[model samples]
Target: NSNICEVCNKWGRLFCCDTCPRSFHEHCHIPSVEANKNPWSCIFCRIKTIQERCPESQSGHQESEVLMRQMLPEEQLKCEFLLLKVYCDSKSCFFASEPYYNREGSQGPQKPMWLNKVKTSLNEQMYTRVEGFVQDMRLIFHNHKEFYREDKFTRLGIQVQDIFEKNFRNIFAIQETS
Candidate 1:
């Protein structure tokens, strides 16, 4: 049970892009897809296609689209995060900080500075993908807290701390795996 395919005009498991009203069966698209995943792009839309689809510079202080097109997405994200940390005037806001035990010791407000700063309204799929990475870091932080509570004051406490640091490194994207 599927909608009519865009390329063949036949019914099948059709994958569609939310950005453009285009759909295709697995074999119809180049680099065929076997499953339907949201945040998916059709052949016409790509992460690297910045010149035509990207929004204009948000703050007029951003690198030109021509420069961004030359960099890999991960490298671009890293560079943008670095700029955000400096411009936003808060370190703990973008980076993770330990949970505060008192009202006055609480961390600064969390800011999706990169998300706000990016010219992504025209190419929202890219925004969603980066947002997903940020969400992954948040989940890892919660898991670390759970592990700490479970092992605190026990013989396994030292092991839990080791695991927690590993996870922190992962969330920071400084390590490959937690």
Candidate 2:
């Protein structure tokens, strides 16, 4: 609905999704927008298509746990969806890019983590277990929290974390066990 790019929230020449209200700059969307492609669907809509094709397991907790451990087709899709969701959010740019600009060579131990690195690991199949992927996602937020302390950047990181955790639970159907 907006005239700006939804992911970066910047004004520009944009591409509109046929299936959703979201718009993106040509370079902002993952897989990037192609000028020749007519009636394009956004990543969110593509996730819906996959969900409809293969509904999530509603059987039980143990089954869901097993699903989380394996990087099968369904699980792989879920991970991809989660990453895309994070990438599409406007605030993600803070955590997505390098933060070491002025702080380079001036610090305590830097366990450098960012959204793009996580996506790369995921694409390379570096995570043997879903927990590895989940850990890296959390690490990105943790690093942000450490670097920014209580500033607006930390809050943005928390916002993205909230989105990630919510989607992570629903996609994996993870049950909260006391």
Candidate 3:
């Protein structure tokens, strides 16, 4: 059988975020979801994409490394903040954004440079950076946390990725013939 949207009761593949892990339909969550088939985005990732607003960063670090858009500068460097924004062009791009990263952390293990140099709790530092990233995101989308919340709050469609290696083939398999 098919899932139903809690809001409008639309039938389609629903999803949950890896971070927030709530479930909801793609269309119900984002009106112009950008992808009807192929790697669908949960509300959490979608919210993150717009909030972090990568592909156009005013920072040197991203909001949440939990899931992010493309990196800034297209060239990794030290001592800089970054942002993650959504271009909303492809399904795989969105899906790829779900897995978080803190690149090159292994370089400095027993007391990383982030602690001795940046001189802040890594987690706390990440929080501050992510918050600012989201704020800039608020301006990016005319102050719409509802859209972000849409990504964070949902209760379905979280496990449809087993076949994502096949991409759109997985999505179109469920399409109606009428």
Candidate 4:
């Protein structure tokens, strides 16, 4: 049903709209899908959209933005952690990207390629990049205990629970745990 247009209910030629939930048939789509590229915006969606960049056919400069946009929320969270780990491992890259984030009035180093991408997403007002980062950290402390020694995990868990109250209450209220 999602694949068929509301007007045509045909499946032979389908075009999915990026802005709205409804898909369209080639004939039923009033403006026609040929006017746009893949991840096509139907007539109704075109006007309502925020002018999104299509990473699927984007250039290398937007690769990170493209990459992050393609992931599920869970994977996006882990992807932020992956980049954050890269940031922790390479201080030099972090400093290089500082100029980029500094211009945006954000506080942080931005050297890692992955991190630079996440920051771009943030600038685009995709706050999910930050939310995903914090969630990934929570997952590291709460779900993946095997990554650390038992004592270390316990200590980190307590510290992170405090972080939730002090810094990230708005990100998501990570609860106190025993």
lDDT winner: 2
> What does candidate 1's lDDT look like per residue over 1-178, in tens digits?
2366654567767887766777777655534554747778654454334424544421232123222233345434433333222222322232233333323433333432232323232124343343343343344344444434544422233443344344323323342322
TM accuracy, model 3: 0.20
Deviation from truth (RMSD, Å), model 2: 4.1
Quantify how close model 1 is to the true structure by its C-alpha RMSD in Å. Answer: 14.9
Please identify which of the two predictions, 2 or 3, would achieve the higher lDDT against the true structure.
Answer: 2
**How many pairs of residues collide in model 2?**
0
For candidate 2, write residues 53-159 as lDDT tens digits. 76656333453465458777556666877787787677777778756734543342267788888777877888877777888888888777776765565687789
Worst 10 residues of 4 by lDDT: 94-103
Ranking of candidates on TM-score, top first: 2, 1, 4, 3
How high is the lDDT of residue 71 in model 1? 35
User: Model 4 off-target regions past 4 Å?
Assistant: 50-178
lDDT of candidate model 3 versus the reference: 0.31
| Ranked by lDDT, top first | 2, 4, 1, 3
Per-residue lDDT over 78-105 for candidate 3, one digit per residue giving the tens place of the 0 to 100 score:
1121221121222213322222223342
For residues 66-90, what per-residue lDDT tens digits would candidate 4 score against the true structure?
Answer: 3344345533433433333333323
Give all TM-scores, in the order shown. 0.26, 0.68, 0.20, 0.25
Task: Go through the candidates in order and give each one's C-alpha lDDT.
Answer: 0.41, 0.73, 0.31, 0.41
